[PDB]
Symmetry: C2
Subunit: 100 residues, 2 copies
């Protein structure tokens, strides 16, 4: 008898009355639409690879403190850039003793 | 000692073993989030305010249907961008590039 509406989303957001901080219902239009693969870099840490000089985005669990676990990982790979970069790190300033 | 110490994230300046693609554990520097619209909030819409001629970030909950709201909050004047925006919207809400 009656037909429903399943479309809940405006395309991007369309044109509406926007409620912003200090703006109680002001005519405003939408721009952009964070849906293409990445929406926004959130809760991600900017991990800048020291040796390979490359910016990556990782999380807390993707990062292991050598201040204590220097002994745990050492230098697991023998590569010219790997060993060189990790060596530049092996003489790091913030070292809480070489003994573990 | 601002209120309570809850911040426990990796603070820009620390350095750890990073786990990236092609790198089991490569020591990388920790940098915090750039902070420039992107930092957090995954799905957020950008909104162009005709009023103050600004661009802000809002969500679906902050965008109210104008076809009904325009009739509710129809109180212009004194506020330039409100009057300008209301007209710029009234004479072109769907953007008349076909039937005008």
């Amino acid at each position: 008898m009656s037909r429903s509406n399943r479309q809940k989303e405006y395309k991007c957001g369309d044109l509406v009355f926007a409620k912003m901080k200090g703006y109680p219902h002001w005519p405003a239009r939408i721009d952009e639409m964070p849906e293409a693969a990445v929406k926004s870099t959130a809760n991600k840490y900017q991990v800048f690879f020291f040796g390979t000089h490359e910016t990556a985005f990782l999380g807390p669990k993707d990062l292991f403190p050598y201040e204590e676990s220097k002994e745990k990982f050492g230098k697991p790979n023998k590569r010219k850039g790997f060993s060189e970069g990790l060596w530049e790190i092996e003489n790091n300033p913030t070292v809480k003793a070489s003994g573990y």
